[PDB]
Design a protein around this motif. Sequence first.
Motif, PDB file in Angstrom:
ATOM      1  N   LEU A  24       0.679  -1.230  -0.431  1.00 15.03           N
ATOM      2  CA  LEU A  24      -0.204   0.352   0.035  1.00 15.03           C
ATOM      3  C   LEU A  24       0.754   0.973   0.308  1.00 15.03           C
ATOM      4  CD1 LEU A  24      -3.247  -0.574   1.781  1.00 15.03           C
ATOM      5  CD2 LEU A  24      -2.689  -0.569  -0.701  1.00 15.03           C
ATOM      6  N   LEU A  27       1.908   1.393  -3.831  1.00 16.48           N
ATOM      7  CA  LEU A  27       1.145   2.258  -4.442  1.00 16.48           C
ATOM      8  C   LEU A  27       0.668   3.352  -4.050  1.00 16.48           C
ATOM      9  CD1 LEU A  27      -2.282  -0.696  -5.853  1.00 16.48           C
ATOM     10  CD2 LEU A  27      -2.512   1.460  -4.465  1.00 16.48           C
ATOM     11  N   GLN A  28       0.316   4.273  -3.546  1.00 14.99           N
ATOM     12  CA  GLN A  28      -0.172   4.756  -3.021  1.00 14.99           C
ATOM     13  C   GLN A  28       0.701   6.152  -4.202  1.00 14.99           C
ATOM     14  OE1 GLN A  28       0.598   6.459   1.219  1.00 14.99           O
ATOM     15  NE2 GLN A  28      -2.132   5.766   1.674  1.00 14.99           N
ATOM     16  N   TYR A  29       2.211   5.822  -3.851  1.00 11.43           N
ATOM     17  CA  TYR A  29       2.760   7.001  -5.016  1.00 11.43           C
ATOM     18  C   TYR A  29       2.662   6.796  -6.650  1.00 11.43           C
ATOM     19  CZ  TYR A  29       5.652   9.633  -1.854  1.00 11.43           C
ATOM     20  OH  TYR A  29       5.423  10.043  -0.836  1.00 11.43           O
TER      21      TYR A  29
ATOM     22  N   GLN B  74     -11.772   0.828 -18.235  1.00 10.38           N
ATOM     23  CA  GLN B  74     -11.221   0.103 -17.249  1.00 10.38           C
ATOM     24  C   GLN B  74     -10.111  -1.376 -17.469  1.00 10.38           C
ATOM     25  OE1 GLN B  74      -9.108   0.866 -13.994  1.00 10.38           O
ATOM     26  NE2 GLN B  74      -9.571   2.909 -14.138  1.00 10.38           N
ATOM     27  N   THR B  87     -14.955   3.842  -8.503  1.00 13.87           N
ATOM     28  CA  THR B  87     -13.858   3.967  -9.320  1.00 13.87           C
ATOM     29  C   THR B  87     -13.513   5.105  -9.640  1.00 13.87           C
ATOM     30  OG1 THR B  87     -14.024   1.411  -9.774  1.00 13.87           O
ATOM     31  CG2 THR B  87     -11.846   2.405 -10.173  1.00 13.87           C
ATOM     32  N   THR B  89     -12.220   9.748  -8.706  1.00 13.94           N
ATOM     33  CA  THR B  89     -11.029  10.685  -7.721  1.00 13.94           C
ATOM     34  C   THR B  89     -11.418  11.776  -7.359  1.00 13.94           C
ATOM     35  OG1 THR B  89      -9.487   9.994  -8.847  1.00 13.94           O
ATOM     36  CG2 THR B  89      -9.657  12.112  -7.771  1.00 13.94           C
TER      37      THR B  89
ATOM     38  N   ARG F 174      -7.291   1.781 -19.572  1.00 13.40           N
ATOM     39  CA  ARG F 174      -6.422   0.096 -19.274  1.00 13.40           C
ATOM     40  C   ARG F 174      -7.590  -0.682 -20.160  1.00 13.40           C
ATOM     41  NH1 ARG F 174      -5.510  -3.136 -14.004  1.00 13.40           N
ATOM     42  NH2 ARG F 174      -7.521  -2.623 -13.371  1.00 13.40           N
TER      43      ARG F 174
ATOM     44  N   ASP H  63     -10.829  14.684 -14.290  1.00  9.33           N
ATOM     45  CA  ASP H  63     -10.016  14.370 -13.462  1.00  9.33           C
ATOM     46  C   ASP H  63      -8.961  14.094 -14.657  1.00  9.33           C
ATOM     47  OD1 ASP H  63      -7.962  12.311 -13.130  1.00  9.33           O
ATOM     48  OD2 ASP H  63      -9.235  11.119 -11.620  1.00  9.33           O
TER      49      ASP H  63
ATOM     50  N   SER I  11      -0.025   9.769  -6.538  1.00  9.10           N
ATOM     51  CA  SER I  11      -0.616  10.154  -8.055  1.00  9.10           C
ATOM     52  C   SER I  11      -2.606   9.508  -7.902  1.00  9.10           C
ATOM     53  CB  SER I  11      -0.018  10.119  -9.384  1.00  9.10           C
ATOM     54  OG  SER I  11       1.714  10.151  -8.951  1.00  9.10           O
ATOM     55  N   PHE I  12      -2.898   9.869  -7.653  1.00 10.41           N
ATOM     56  CA  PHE I  12      -4.793   8.658  -6.929  1.00 10.41           C
ATOM     57  C   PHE I  12      -5.086   9.570  -8.356  1.00 10.41           C
ATOM     58  CE2 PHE I  12      -8.806   9.137  -4.587  1.00 10.41           C
ATOM     59  CZ  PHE I  12      -8.244   7.272  -4.607  1.00 10.41           C
ATOM     60  N   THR I  13      -5.456   8.562  -8.976  1.00 12.41           N
ATOM     61  CA  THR I  13      -6.441   8.003 -10.346  1.00 12.41           C
ATOM     62  C   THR I  13      -7.096   6.799 -10.270  1.00 12.41           C
ATOM     63  OG1 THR I  13      -5.292   6.948 -11.762  1.00 12.41           O
ATOM     64  CG2 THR I  13      -3.910   8.583 -11.374  1.00 12.41           C
ATOM     65  N   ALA I  14      -7.781   7.046 -11.090  1.00 11.53           N
ATOM     66  CA  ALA I  14      -8.662   5.688 -11.200  1.00 11.53           C
ATOM     67  C   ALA I  14      -8.297   4.443 -11.211  1.00 11.53           C
ATOM     68  CB  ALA I  14     -10.096   5.958 -12.365  1.00 11.53           C
ATOM     69  N   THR I  15      -7.223   4.155 -11.415  1.00 10.51           N
ATOM     70  CA  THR I  15      -6.756   2.713 -11.783  1.00 10.51           C
ATOM     71  C   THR I  15      -6.600   2.608 -10.424  1.00 10.51           C
ATOM     72  OG1 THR I  15      -5.149   1.168 -12.369  1.00 10.51           O
ATOM     73  CG2 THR I  15      -4.924   3.217 -13.178  1.00 10.51           C
ATOM     74  N   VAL I  16      -5.370   3.482  -9.848  1.00 10.64           N
ATOM     75  CA  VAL I  16      -4.539   2.991  -8.993  1.00 10.64           C
ATOM     76  C   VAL I  16      -6.065   3.173  -7.371  1.00 10.64           C
ATOM     77  CG1 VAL I  16      -2.482   4.407  -9.374  1.00 10.64           C
ATOM     78  CG2 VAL I  16      -4.576   5.221  -8.271  1.00 10.64           C
ATOM     79  N   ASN I  17      -7.366   3.944  -7.753  1.00 13.01           N
ATOM     80  CA  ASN I  17      -8.131   3.768  -6.194  1.00 13.01           C
ATOM     81  C   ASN I  17      -8.559   2.226  -7.130  1.00 13.01           C
ATOM     82  OD1 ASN I  17     -10.284   4.270  -5.073  1.00 13.01           O
ATOM     83  ND2 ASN I  17     -11.263   4.718  -6.663  1.00 13.01           N
ATOM     84  N   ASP I  18      -9.130   1.405  -7.810  1.00 17.21           N
ATOM     85  CA  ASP I  18      -9.488   0.266  -8.370  1.00 17.21           C
ATOM     86  C   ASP I  18      -8.525  -0.549  -7.565  1.00 17.21           C
ATOM     87  OD1 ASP I  18      -9.772  -1.402 -11.413  1.00 17.21           O
ATOM     88  OD2 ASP I  18      -9.738  -2.323  -8.989  1.00 17.21           O
ATOM     89  N   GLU I  19      -7.297  -0.343  -7.847  1.00 19.73           N
ATOM     90  CA  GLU I  19      -6.282  -1.178  -7.219  1.00 19.73           C
ATOM     91  C   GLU I  19      -6.310  -1.174  -5.610  1.00 19.73           C
ATOM     92  OE1 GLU I  19      -2.414  -1.942  -9.113  1.00 19.73           O
ATOM     93  OE2 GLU I  19      -3.206  -0.368 -10.392  1.00 19.73           O
ATOM     94  N   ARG I  20      -6.168   0.349  -4.899  1.00 21.71           N
ATOM     95  CA  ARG I  20      -6.709   0.268  -3.692  1.00 21.71           C
ATOM     96  C   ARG I  20      -8.051  -0.549  -2.656  1.00 21.71           C
ATOM     97  NH1 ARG I  20      -4.626   3.807   0.285  1.00 21.71           N
ATOM     98  NH2 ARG I  20      -6.429   2.979   1.253  1.00 21.71           N
ATOM     99  N   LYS I  21      -8.924  -0.466  -4.054  1.00 27.61           N
ATOM    100  CA  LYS I  21      -9.884  -0.995  -3.096  1.00 27.61           C
ATOM    101  C   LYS I  21     -10.047  -2.771  -3.929  1.00 27.61           C
ATOM    102  CE  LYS I  21     -13.142   2.125  -4.252  1.00 27.61           C
ATOM    103  NZ  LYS I  21     -13.695   2.990  -3.328  1.00 27.61           N
ATOM    104  N   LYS I  22      -9.696  -3.182  -4.542  1.00 34.86           N
ATOM    105  CA  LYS I  22      -9.773  -4.479  -5.049  1.00 34.86           C
ATOM    106  C   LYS I  22      -8.691  -5.167  -3.443  1.00 34.86           C
ATOM    107  CE  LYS I  22      -7.327  -6.282  -8.355  1.00 34.86           C
ATOM    108  NZ  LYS I  22      -7.068  -5.885 -10.127  1.00 34.86           N
ATOM    109  N   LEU I  23      -7.510  -4.266  -3.686  1.00 33.42           N
ATOM    110  CA  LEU I  23      -6.121  -4.777  -2.705  1.00 33.42           C
ATOM    111  C   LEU I  23      -6.628  -4.743  -0.672  1.00 33.42           C
ATOM    112  CD1 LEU I  23      -1.996  -4.386  -2.301  1.00 33.42           C
ATOM    113  CD2 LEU I  23      -3.679  -3.998  -0.622  1.00 33.42           C
TER     114      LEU I  23
END
Lengths: 43, 145, 172, 244, 98, 212, 98, 288, 49
Positions: A24, A27-29, B74, B87, B89, F174, H63, I11-23
């Motif tokens: 985490l 990945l935060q970066y 996605q 999903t 921001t 993606r 965004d 860098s908070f974007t849609a894909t990192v948000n998706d991965e955050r939620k999944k993980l």
Amino acid sequence: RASCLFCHHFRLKSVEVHRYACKLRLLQYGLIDESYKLDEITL
Amino acid sequence: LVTEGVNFQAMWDQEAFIDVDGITSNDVAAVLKTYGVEAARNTIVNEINNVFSRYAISVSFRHLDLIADMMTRQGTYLAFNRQGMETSTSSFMKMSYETTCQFLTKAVLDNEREQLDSPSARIVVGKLNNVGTGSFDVLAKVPNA
Amino acid sequence: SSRHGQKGVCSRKWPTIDMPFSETGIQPDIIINPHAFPSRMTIGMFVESLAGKAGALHGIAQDSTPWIFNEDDTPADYFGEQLAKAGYNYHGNEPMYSGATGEELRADIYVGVVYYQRLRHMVNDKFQVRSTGPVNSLTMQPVKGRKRHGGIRVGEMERDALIGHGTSFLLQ
Amino acid sequence: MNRQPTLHKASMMGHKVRVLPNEKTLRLHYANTGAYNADFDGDEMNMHFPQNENARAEALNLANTDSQYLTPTSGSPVRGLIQDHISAGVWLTSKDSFFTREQYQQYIYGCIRPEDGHTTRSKIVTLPPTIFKPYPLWTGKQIITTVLLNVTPPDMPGINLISKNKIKNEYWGKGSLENEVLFKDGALLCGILDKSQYGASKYGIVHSLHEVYGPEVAAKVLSVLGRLFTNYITATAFTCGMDD
Amino acid sequence: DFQQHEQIRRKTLKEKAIPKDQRATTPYMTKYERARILGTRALQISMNAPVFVDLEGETDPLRIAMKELAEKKIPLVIRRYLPDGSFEDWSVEELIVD
Amino acid sequence: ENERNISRLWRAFRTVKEMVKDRGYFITQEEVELPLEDFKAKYCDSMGRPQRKMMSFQANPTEESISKFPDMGSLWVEFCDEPSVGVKTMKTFVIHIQEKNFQTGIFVYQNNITPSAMKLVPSIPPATIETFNEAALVVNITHHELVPKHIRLSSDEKRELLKRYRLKESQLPRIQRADPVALYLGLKRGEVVKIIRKSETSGRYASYRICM
Amino acid sequence: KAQGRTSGKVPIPGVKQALEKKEGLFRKHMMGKRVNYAARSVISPDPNIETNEIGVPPVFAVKLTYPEPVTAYNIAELRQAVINGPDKWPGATQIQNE
Amino acid sequence: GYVKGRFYSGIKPQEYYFHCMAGREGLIDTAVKTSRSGYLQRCLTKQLEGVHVSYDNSIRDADGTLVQFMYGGDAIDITKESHMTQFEFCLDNYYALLKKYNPSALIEHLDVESALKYSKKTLKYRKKHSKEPHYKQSVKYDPVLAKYNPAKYLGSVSENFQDKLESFLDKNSKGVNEKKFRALMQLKYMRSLINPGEAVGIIASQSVGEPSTQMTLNTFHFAGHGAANVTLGIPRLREIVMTASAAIKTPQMTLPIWNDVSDEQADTFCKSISKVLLSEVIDKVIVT
Amino acid sequence: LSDGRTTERGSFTATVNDERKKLVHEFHKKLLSRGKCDNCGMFSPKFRK
RNA sequence: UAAAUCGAGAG
DNA sequence: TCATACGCCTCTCTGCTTATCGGTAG
DNA sequence: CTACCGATAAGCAGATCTCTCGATTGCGTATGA
Ligand SMILES: [Mg+2]
Ligand SMILES: [Zn+2]
């Protein structure tokens, strides 16, 4: 619910704890590829 | 020939009677899972356009293409509901959409910070929008000394 | 409205001079646009026009219960006989002159008398205007209600449409 | 102005203001009914008054009604006259329509009022009559031609358009060519102007005028044609009856 | 005490600034830009901003601004914003109407 | 029955060769357009058994592939003879991959594979091991009409595109890591792909996705 | 989440109930609000306006106002409107000082 | 229900009853059709409220997440796409169109030669590479829209528009030359570009939802002798967009057939591939 | 951070948000999965609702 | 001047 | 006898989530 | 033999545009008069 009363840690292992913490943090970066590549440090 | 159910691998064996190069299906999730994102986008456009053939209101494909590319932005068959909305921001637009309690809890639990990008967030705060006339800025040129 | 479900709002009070006058000097009191009929198919109104004209001419009353006429006793023909005997046009038309040019119109106008009923839903009950006035306490927004001098609502659909134009200062 | 529900963009335009000191209801032209999907079924629609010059200019240019000629759904037009002006055009553009000098000039000035800026040139210019002897006689197509030639900006060639209309040739006699609409250097030479020429019909005369001279000229042409078909309909009214 | 706060923002501001030699956006002035510039110019004139275009008894600031744009003397500079935050600086004089 | 199974195995082999060629290794039109008579003359026993042991082969990069990707390595494949997947039958392959020093490894099974391999396949960096199924490659997916032309996009081109559009790797559209297209391309995550869509209103227009 | 009700009269809504449904504060007071300087009435047709104007009745024209600022060229027209006053169209209702 | 009467000469009472029944059906369907669009419209516009075309002619959410690089692959405004295919009309009105466009003032802020040469090279490349399988088309020159900005380089047009223009200029031989006409048509394509700032997301949401208000239980109810009868209308649209259902009501696929397979040797394939249940061959059972 | 791939703010974007939620969801689900504490051995009883 | 529920409803 | 303040007084669609029962490793 | 992993079946949770009028607002009860 997922906690231990005696040791006061998560009922999962204490190495998965650091695995997920580092994942985490990295990945935060926005280093997504690095986050998945970290799991290759297994030995 | 048109079947009554989706299973691509069934006719893949019968090469003699079917030209497997043109197997298009009424399904979308199966197309996404067995043919990648782009085939899913093509079938999304096709199945949202053929619904406008019957009940004929012709619509330009630019809108349908934008819809499909947003549905598969996605790499998966997303949806235009709360199940395919988190999903994002900016959570202001999500909680304006629906389930204000659900999205606010997640928004504050992870200390999610809204950068005021979506129009709904700008409206809630009360800032000039970012689409169209508010997509740029105006500077005054002054001849000082 | 007539007795055939033909609504209509009085668009303008046409002055009698500008009103088209007929050969006999009869200026009609109500104009119905002919384009309504081809989609509505209220031929009952067309029949009632000449039936009422014949009734007013001969000082009689014609019954209009459904299923009195038939294929071989067409009401148009039946009332046209009476109109011709009275001396008007058998088809119910009537020569007319424009009230502005004064010249005879291209074709004889269809004129008659029909039963017209006013409706309860007025116009002043739909009136509304607000510049400033009372505001809500917890939102500082205009109140709701016609009698309360409250404003109209620019809802989600209106907001989204205002965005779609590309207009942003209008939205603000 | 807005006619709820505001389903799409055209249901919220920006109209200019005209203060009629007679009535107590809002007055709206007929071209906007198709766009608003409105009626005159006692419909009530809102009227917002923007208060800052930003909003004024933004509604006058981006949200104004002329710029909304074509819906973004499929590119088809959404404006144009509807019900009686169409029949008035069908009657006026037929071959039987001959006007003397009086009727021709009156019909032209009834819709090309230059004091309000409808036409560019300071003097209304006319056309030679299609018949010289025994006495001068114009035609309705000549009325349309001079209307176009007076609203079309000068120092620019007229429209060269070839199109059709919904009325078949066989309904006008034998050997007739009224089913085909033809233009040549801003002059109407064949066919009649039914719905397929003004209204929500693509590839019409008003549509081509829009694409050639911008949207403001198309709006002025629509207004002028609506005014002309209104003044002409009072002189020779259109009616229906039981004989039909 | 304040310099470290100021210098970091000016470096970031100068970073996003696209050089004049390599601005690859539309040379024409878009409809939105025309509307915004006309409105802002009209607001300035209404607030007694000086005007160098003669007025023929006109009283509408929006019409005055439209005349200014037609004659191309608007003393305003646009700032086109790229999605990342980079901005290019075109001028109305070098912009093309329609 | 036997002829049908041989035909299916053949078609899987053709798809494997085509997928290797698309990935960018030296493959000719032979071993791809291999006729049935030649296949039954070569890969058959006295009765016509598949004898899939000798169907394995190597893949070496072309000169153009090396120029585009200087780090592109070698590839190895192996088709399991037994109907199931053997634990030791995969251990021999996984040790051989590193023994011969192959950068990439492609594995094909018959019906199913023991879940332990899932836990064990991503174990030897930088070597990458992928697994496919015989019945899932009966017909290629890139030949389908809806599927556009997916072509991998190089690191230099990726940097050029990102600099041109002022983007981040995360901001691109993606594409998942489990699509049959990305697996077909062997697209390592983080690499931008290029798609040539046959748009109805614009003919040919190119779009770029990123696998992540 | 409240537990316990046999007959009652009404379940009182909570804070979460004030921001959740369509009647919630969000969809009712932030995505759309009641507006000032706006009217609503019936529309009657008029083939005598140039397909880009609207027919405003004088009852509307005596209520809705615009805050035109005074200046060196608007002085005459605004002075005339002020002299006319709030009853005679065109006229002024409020004179907002600086 | 078949009535021989006409509204001019009246209808017998049974026909009147049937007509009233049909009118009642219509009156109910009107209410249903008025009720059946709001949620779809609202969800679409809420999702797409932000995505707009940027200054790079690439549409992307507020965004910054890209949706497409080119608006439909061409980036021409739909409201101006009306008369970019009317070659005859454009040729006829050439002089007025040119006076409107003013090509003289559109040179000092424009480049023509590079884009024109690249487009010509690409066009001849695809001409050499037209007839072959699609998966074999190894692109060496991507379409001109990829590099050259269509609003900055004259001649940068779509492959469809360029092909149609070339076909028209080949088929139709007209005093104006083909070169000046081509230059004006390229200027027309440049001028008819969707401006950076268009609320393209709202436009798409409205164009998909507002027509959905005009669909209901229409005449499309077929019971002739037998058909598949897939879902349609706003139920199908909700399934496709709103829910993304992986278990749709009527899933089916299209199977193209080789041109050498006739009605026979294909009907038997259909029967063999069709499902047969045990109940479909048992006449009856006699339980003793 | 050094090469400009990500500013210190992240860098908070849609894909990192998706991965955050999944993980995060998977990690919580794995926390709720087993019952014996493999950190001290002294497992503890769960709680009901 | 509130706030909620029911009926009549208008587009 | 008896009035106002307290105390409560039966004909629709999509997911997600968890419980329980089959199979396989050790 | 027994712990781990999925595969149903039941329950849980939530969905199916503006405005104007009119009407209406609880029984139970328990002690101070
Ligand atoms: Mg209506
Ligand atoms: Zn413990």
